[PDB]
Design a protein around this ligand. Structure first.
Ligand SMILES: [Ca+2]
Ligand SMILES: [Ca+2]
Lengths: 441, 441
């Protein structure tokens, strides 16, 4: 299984407005199929007034700029025709400020009032998030306070209430019923107030369902495992980050620890990624880094157990240094040709880091065998031809500062992988480990 | 008659996706009527892949993100129901690279090759455009060169060809058939190679049609009046700049000579505007300026003969320093409320110069009789009650370096206007105008 995360507005336009949509996506299947993609993770495709859409105003309708429900269902059908699955990003931890549910709660509707979380006489009005450390309780003029982790505009949904659970499970069956193959549950860790209640919530929620369920759950261990049994796929921020740091620090230490910590003997498939929308792009890691280092990052990613995932554009080495609040700097328009002018090209804004004639268009890289695209296509074809690696066991054979060597195997296979994070050959078991290269035997 | 220019994507969202569309536009009729607007000028609503849409790929189809023809017509009808006219930006001067006609030309299609302008053995390949002073001739791999006033991707159509004339003459009818009240032709001065020919063109093209035809013809008040008798409206780029220049220096020299040059004694209506998509916002004029000066410019705009036009958001003091190639910097989302979170609100990217809670939203300024909006509303109410002014005569009653006094009048109406451009109080006939203030009598 190989995954590909897409920001729909910046990928492929299918109606000629320069704005990515459902029809364009439909037409990029040849490309996805060539890059060896099994499934696609689609960032929020529902009604939301933000360019990213993580604050949904109605899960029962899609972002008009992307197309109609009828156009959406036709796209699902075309992907399945070519053997690709569609996984939607489902932000049900909270809603948007403008969702009809929250609006009725504000106007006092008792039914909906309990759909959200309000401050009690014994509520710590000063409680803050982990990261941001910014507040989580928000005031209304009439003296009330509602809880909103991700901000005062993204009010928290109350899962202690059976009504809400029901409302949302009805939505998942509906989309499943529609052909959707699975979901990326955004903020899966904060569904309940305590972690023990959280594991049970997900147990009941996903209980009778089948599909690809992805989640971000940071408890670093033992809970990640508790959750992982239930989801089956867990976003690996640990190793995803570590692969890049080691390559950058040219030192196996972190990568080795991370593998033994987050990759080995799991009762679920960990999902390792080049990068995502909440951070800088693989090519812009630590002040960005060289073509040969980007490449090596991908080599390691595709020679490790679990499911490899590429953020759209990373296969081209697209640039992007994460920044707030204008987080669209990492969501630049995906370039099909150098002039960035061809049927299907998107240009909804001027690019932040990847402008035209930069030698990074798909068209352009397809031709230079030395390109990151040409390289990625190599490892992705390899991986496609070796599905067993997803759940293969890892055996270390060489843990040196400058280089690493391990063995993948299961009952009917075994492959030896060689990673050289430094610049100058070195021989292992008769094999020549070139500078900044990966070798399999 | 008051005009208003809108960048649809940034004005109002009527389908809850945060993108301006034809439906939102229909829902903004209450505001426009309340702001005193007569006709709206809509930036390009045709298919094109650019966020601005000046390089069209099909004039017979609308920008998908804006909506369907079903919804475009619903908007035309609604505006008309409130007595507001709809004028559409019509870039028929050229087409985009991706337009069907050009693709066929590129293939040497007999018929379509002559739809465009191809270089000669007797053509100056290094020829340049006045303004920025750049090449109008663009190369092709196979030795060919086509002419493109606005670049390699905005190929020039050839109006020497009767077919191109007919082709476009029909589009015009097609649009007028839909209830469209007029067009704004860009680069209207470059329709034919010689200005004696251009005039001939427009005379014939517009000859048998009726409607509001806006144009920019920089023959610097010379040939300018010949085209003015034909369109009936002339974008007075001249005085529009001099108002701002003057306010900025607090010296009435440029405004008086400008008024004498463009507004006085013309056989057509000069349209005086706050700004447009091609320059910095009024409020960001030359380092930009204070609430006081922004208010004066407006005051001066609404007290001159001709037709006053506001670029969407200028009635609020929206900031925007023009620059390339990301010309979207002056197209910031129109702020309906401080949080920029209210149904109808657009938020397709993070504001470049007008982020949330900056005290310039319609909602915030509406309850403040000292705001720019309240000021503008006052001038639109006045201008609404004094039609006669558009075609009125103005004679100077006083000219000083720091202030200015003139009289607007016609056979049955007379009004004295006193403007003060300096930071200190000034007097004229037992009447002192406080700094930056205006008073009519
Ligand atoms: Ca589109
Ligand atoms: Ca919209």
């Amino acid at each position: 299984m190989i995954g590909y995360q897409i920001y729909v507005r910046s990928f492929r336009d299918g109606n000629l407005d320069g704005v990515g949509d459902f029809r364009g996506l439909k037409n990029a299947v040849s490309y996805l199929k060539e890059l060896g993609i099994d499934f696609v993770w689609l960032m929020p495709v529902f009604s939301s007034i933000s360019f990213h859409g993580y604050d949904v105003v109605d899960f029962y309708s899609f972002k008009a700029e992307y197309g109609s429900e009828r156009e959406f269902k036709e796209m699902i059908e075309a992907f399945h025709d070519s053997g690709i699955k569609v996984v939607l990003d489902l932000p049900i931890h909270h809603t948007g400020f403008l969702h009809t549910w929250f609006q009725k709660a504000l106007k006092g509707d008792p039914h909906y009032r309990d759909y959200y979380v309000w401050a009690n006489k014994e509520t710590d009005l000063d409680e803050r998030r982990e990261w941001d450390g910014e507040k989580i309780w928000h005031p209304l003029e009439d003296g009330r306070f509602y809880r909103g982790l991700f901000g005062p505009f993204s009010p928290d949904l109350n899962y202690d209430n059976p009504q809400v659970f029901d409302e949302m499970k009805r939505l998942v069956l509906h989309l499943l019923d529609m052909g959707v193959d699975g979901f990326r549950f955004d903020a899966a860790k904060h569904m309940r107030d305590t972690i023990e209640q959280n594991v049970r919530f997900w147990k009941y929620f996903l209980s009778d369902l089948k599909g690809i369920f992805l989640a971000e759950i940071w408890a670093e261990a033992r809970m990640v495992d508790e959750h992982g049994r239930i989801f089956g796929y867990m976003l690996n921020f640990d190793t995803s980050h570590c692969i890049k740091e080691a390559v950058w620090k040219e030192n196996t230490r972190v990568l080795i620890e991370s593998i033994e910590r987050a990759v080995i003997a799991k009762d679920y498939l960990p999902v390792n990624f080049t990068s995502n929308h909440d951070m800088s792009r693989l090519a812009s890691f630590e002040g960005g880094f060289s073509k040969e280092k980007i490449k090596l990052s991908i080599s390691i990613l595709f020679t490790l157990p679990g499911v490899p995932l590429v953020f759209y554009g990373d296969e081209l080495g697209m640039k992007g240094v994460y920044q707030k609040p204008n987080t669209e700097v990492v969501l630049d328009p995906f370039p099909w040709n150098e002039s960035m002018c061809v049927e299907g090209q998107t240009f909804w804004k001027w690019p932040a880091y990847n402008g035209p004639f930069s030698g990074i268009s798909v068209e352009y890289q397809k031709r230079d065998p030395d390109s990151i695209l040409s390289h990625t296509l190599g490892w992705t074809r390899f991986r496609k031809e070796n599905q067993w690696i997803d759940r293969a066991k890892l055996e270390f054979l060489c843990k040196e500062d400058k280089f690493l060597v391990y063995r993948l195997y299961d009952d009917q296979h075994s492959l030896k992988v060689f990673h050289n994070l430094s610049g100058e050959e070195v021989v292992f078991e008769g094999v020549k480990m070139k500078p900044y290269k990966t070798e399999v035997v």
